[PDB]
Symmetry: C3
């Protein structure tokens, strides 16, 4: 406890945790080699989100950064979580659409830069600089979203209707959800202090649980994952 946002963290820890248990149980005895990958990728996302949120609740994933003439509390664990989970979500989309290795590598590369560059931004002591990294990170994201919206859709159009429509849903959700992140970051205590850490944490929480549990639900409950 202590920190006023501890509650959104513990709630997030709980949801990632149960979300994992459920996906695990649901994938129990699934032999389809293709479904397995989908289950392994999707189940690993919340499992990681769980460990990271718990680190924020317990205090480990929290550090202090001086900028703006003050010591600001920065949750680095969010980045460590995203670093490993965004690529997996990208893999799910790639497997569903049967993307070229070349484009998978670019997206993954684009993603690592986005999170890494975003983490650098969060830990920068010169207020003004935080926004530069936020722009480099956001540009990287637009590149990923641009390719997922156009390139992948075109790819999904060659799969059977169940796959095509499930991808469309997953596609619309990732574009909307992902674009919300740089916004919250910009208005939260890491960029402009237009919003308090308390709210900043609640937003990322809902944004995080939707992207990892919801996304998993949408995909795993469709037949789209079966060869």
């Amino acid at each position: 406890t202590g920190r006023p946002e501890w509650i959104w963290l513990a709630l997030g820890t709980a949801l990632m945790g149960l979300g994992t248990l459920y996906f695990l149980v649901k994938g129990m005895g699934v032999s389809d080699p293709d479904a397995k990958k989908f289950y392994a990728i999707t189940t690993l996302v919340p499992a990681i989100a769980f460990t990271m949120y718990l680190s924020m609740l317990l205090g480990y994933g929290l550090t202090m950064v001086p900028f703006g003439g003050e010591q600001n509390p920065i949750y680095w664990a969010r980045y460590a979580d995203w670093l490993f989970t965004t690529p997996l979500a990208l893999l799910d989309l790639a497997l569903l659409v049967d993307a070229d290795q070349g484009t998978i590598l670019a997206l993954v590369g684009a993603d690592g830069i986005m999170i890494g560059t975003g983490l650098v931004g969060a830990l920068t002591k010169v207020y003004s600089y935080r926004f530069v990294w936020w722009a480099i990170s956001t540009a990287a994201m637009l590149y990923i979203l641009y390719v997922l919206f156009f390139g992948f859709t075109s790819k999904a159009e060659s799969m059977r209707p169940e796959v095509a429509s499930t991808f469309k849903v997953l596609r619309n959700v990732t574009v909307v959800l992902w674009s919300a992140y740089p916004v919250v970051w910009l208005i939260g205590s890491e960029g402009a202090g237009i919003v308090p850490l308390n709210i900043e944490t609640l937003l990322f929480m809902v944004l995080d649980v939707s992207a990892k549990v919801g996304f998993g639900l949408i995909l795993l409950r469709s037949r789209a994952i079966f060869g």
Copy 2:
């Protein structure tokens, strides 16, 4: 020198080093594309263990963590070593058994969580919390071992007898050896101080050399690695 455990560290450095030289020399001119992978994975394990142990001997891989109302010496390099070496050992087992990519990804994912979560546990300042991470890490391990014992055996049963029996041996050794780690950690200066750092280091040393040099010996000296 200095630290009373320097000797187990230097001895470990020596053994990882010679273990690498030997595996390297032994793999010299091997054309079998399958044997090569086995040699590349197995030879890389001690090569990494070498660099990490040397970092502990020289002092770099040693840090201090306050918990229990004291500054405890923590060898983080052990974790950095394990982070990269456990996945490789898992790859060896997977290649021997011809595991599904989906299960390879889950194990690797399970493994990163195990070591990462274990490293977080080692660096936590709130004594009580160290044990929580130890449980999350140990649960992750049981998942890996459960899948390697049942899932893989079943897989090996479809390979020729040389492969089947070599896997059985490797399987029995990893289960026994791996389960020893969380125990040493629990009774060592990182959990309950039932045992001194001096002994704690000697145990991990023997546990480490057996798992990386011994395991490599067992596998590399069998015909099991040949297509």
Copy 3:
């Protein structure tokens, strides 16, 4: 500004940045699945070099290390950059030559050790030790270069002449360029202070831009990347 080497850093940031824009634009609408990988790998190298150089210019990728009875400025970001970019360059060479997965894994493994071990060397407080890690790192490099010069050439000899000769060029450039790194490091402020940080930074700059932009140019402007 401030640091006397800021200029070589900003110039490097600019060149990596433009080098990326150009490779991106050049790869615009390329359908050849093989060419795409080549473009994705090659374009990602400078994109990462860009983010890292910018971190050095802005000051983030700069830290201070005490050794020799003084606080020496150490640019860790160089290592973080190399950690991700050398493996990619290795992948390009591997794809051009169609290397065995086993050898790809060994080189990548050899490379991570080289950079990691080199980073450890840069951050070591005991002057004398810095040179030990420099030797372990350099040995790792010789292993990579030895395999790229002999093993790969032999491999390229089985491809069509355009591929064979482009590889020869790329091969000669990586051997010469890569061997220059441990030298600059040895004579620069990180090893023997025979050369000032100012020059040390200018050399790595030219060495870096040549290896990432030049290399990319040579490869991407040849037909060698087409199946």
